[PDB]
Amino acid sequence: RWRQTWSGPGTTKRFPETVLARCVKYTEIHPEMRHVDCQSVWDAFKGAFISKHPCDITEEDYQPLMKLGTQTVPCNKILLWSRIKDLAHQFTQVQRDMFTLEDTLLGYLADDLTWCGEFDTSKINYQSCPDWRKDCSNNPVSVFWKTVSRRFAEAACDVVHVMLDGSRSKIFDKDSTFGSVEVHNLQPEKVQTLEAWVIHGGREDSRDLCQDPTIKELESIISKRNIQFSCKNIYRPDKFLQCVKNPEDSSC
Ligand SMILES: Nc1nc(O[C@@H]2O[C@H](COP(=O)(O)O)[C@@H](O)[C@H]2O)c2ncn([C@@H]3O[C@H](COP(=O)(O)OP(=O)(O)OP(=O)(O)O)[C@@H](O)[C@H]3O)c2n1
Structure with missing residues (x-):
């Protein structure tokens, strides 16, 4: 298709598989995260943005994932x-x-990845996602990093x-x-x-x-x-x- 809905890169290819695999690797390496259920993590991550307008994401959307990713x-x-x-x-x-933040489970899961969904479908958008500048700042990726960086700084x-x-x-x-x-x-x-x-x-x-x-x-x-x-x-x-x-x- 010669044009796309948003101005930013679309979701990273095989995003679900990538996040899942990163969660498995992390919890395999980091003992304190050894009980973490990577399926539940993936589901909570999904829950923050799937079926939601990708210019209408809030910090609250990420709270289930934040809870699961709680880490000292x-x-x-x-x-x-x-x-x-x-x-x-x-x-x-x-x-x-x-x-660094990328040494935490949540920072490790998201590092270098792009993702977004679509209002009123459950599809991941692999074609484009909102650019922070050109489109909207309340997008799934920008909101994720703001939320996790705030928590990391408060610790x-x-x-x-x-x-x-x-x-x-x-x-x-x-x-x-x-x-x-x-x-x-x-x-x-x-x-x-x-x-x-x-x-x-x-x-x-x-x-x-x-x-x-x-x-x-x-x-x-x-x-x-x-x-x-x-x-x-x-x-x-x-x-x-x-x-x-x-x-x-x-x-x-
Ligand atoms: N790995 C990682 N860690 C982040 O966060 C903490 O944030 C700090 C680094 O972010 P900073 O360079 O913005 O200060 C570190 O102290 C970490 O503790 C990120 N905070 C934002 N990003 C992401 O890095 C990517 C590139 O952002 P950019 O800052 O280079 O350009 P951008 O501001 O998005 O350009 P724009 O189109 O004008 O909005 C985007 O996916 C953006 O969401 C992040 N990526």
């Missing part, structure tokens, strides 16, 4: 990220120094870290999930500090990007929530990862 995360070891998920993930993969305590992409024109972006949801849902009663790691993309010698106006904005916002702010440059992410794998080892 070590509160002082949370790593948030904005844009640069590959480094964040490569980092936590070394020795589980920290946990954090002590020092919370965030990797930010220093090669972007807005290192801290208030419109991102990190900036619009996570920063506002850290609980000042529990969270002592937010420490930003600003990942350089520019090769070799570069600025102190902790002085970037958007970082100063982030500092102001966090400080005004009664949370301390710290910032560090990571000048060579490749060296950084090497030092994580082999610390004190070289020129670290």
Whole structure:
């Protein structure tokens, strides 16, 4: 068909099979999730968006799935990220120094996937799904991430870290999930500090990007929530990862 209902990519091929298989793998690997019934998880995930208008999804739609995906995360070891998920993930993969959202069952189930249904049919839409900008923000994927990211941020305590992409024109972006949801849902009663790691993309010698106006904005916002702010440059992410794998080892 030469045209489609929405402007975004349609549901990821074999979405039901993919989510199911991810749930099985996760609960097989992660002991604490060992009892989880992956069929019930799939059904609850389905229940959030099937037969529903994909511009009319709410956080409530995802509550059955949230309940089933309830999981304790070590509160002082949370790593948030904005844009640069590959480094964040490569980092936590070394020795589980920290946990990102994609290390939780629910984040793992949905990572890199697109999905939506149709009002008044039970069909998954494999042709297109709403674009957040062009179509609607209350779509199944955007609403899912907002809901799960809020919960993840509320679970954090002590020092919370965030990797930010220093090669972007807005290192801290208030419109991102990190900036619009996570920063506002850290609980000042529990969270002592937010420490930003600003990942350089520019090769070799570069600025102190902790002085970037958007970082100063982030500092102001966090400080005004009664949370301390710290910032560090990571000048060579490749060296950084090497030092994580082999610390004190070289020129670290
Ligand atoms: N794996 C993952 N984790 C998310 O969430 C937490 O959110 C943070 C990262 O999101 P951020 O980069 O937006 O801050 C991390 O701290 C995680 O703890 C996501 N929050 C949103 N997404 C999804 O990432 C995909 C690309 O989004 P984009 O931010 O690159 O571009 P977008 O804002 O959707 O462009 P638009 O068309 O103008 O709306 C979309 O599927 C979007 O729904 C997400 N994907």
